[PDB]
């Protein structure tokens, strides 16, 4: 937790449709609300901090 990772994911088309129905993800509350599976609104870069 104190060493959460940090890696840029860019120059590609993120398809979040393959994330659901696999160990169901609870608490998917978004502050950047986008019901279209976090896509259709193309951005510059994404950072995955786990």
């Amino acid at each position, epitope marked *: 937790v104190y060493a959460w990772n940090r890696k*840029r994911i860019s120059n590609c088309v993120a398809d979040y449709s393959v994330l659901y129905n696999l160990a169901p993800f609870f608490t998917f509350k978004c502050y*950047g609300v986008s019901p279209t599976k976090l896509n259709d609104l193309c951005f510059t870069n994404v*950072y995955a901090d786990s």
Partner: nanobody
Amino acid sequence: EVQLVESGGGLVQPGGSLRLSCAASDFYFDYYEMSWVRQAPGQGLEWVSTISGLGGATYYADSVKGRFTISRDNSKNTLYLQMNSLRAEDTALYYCATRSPFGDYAFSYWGQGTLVTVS
């Protein structure tokens, strides 16, 4: 309530360099976005580069790939722009802006600006 302070030179030899230091104060510069926007006399504004504060990656434009460099410091909240390989076609008014990446597409507010001459 929030302002910006800029500095720099007033005349540059066409082939030399200049020390540009934008000095911000009381900012959330850890997750904010700061860069430079040039203003050439006779036309509108143009984008120069982008300096991400999240990881530290710096992106350049098409014609300034191998002639510019940016150094970001977090000890006293200052940025250094060492402009190299300068010629007579770099006449523009530089503006040090600051925005929030987790917001809209346009910057929040700009500074006062700095003028440089290359001829």
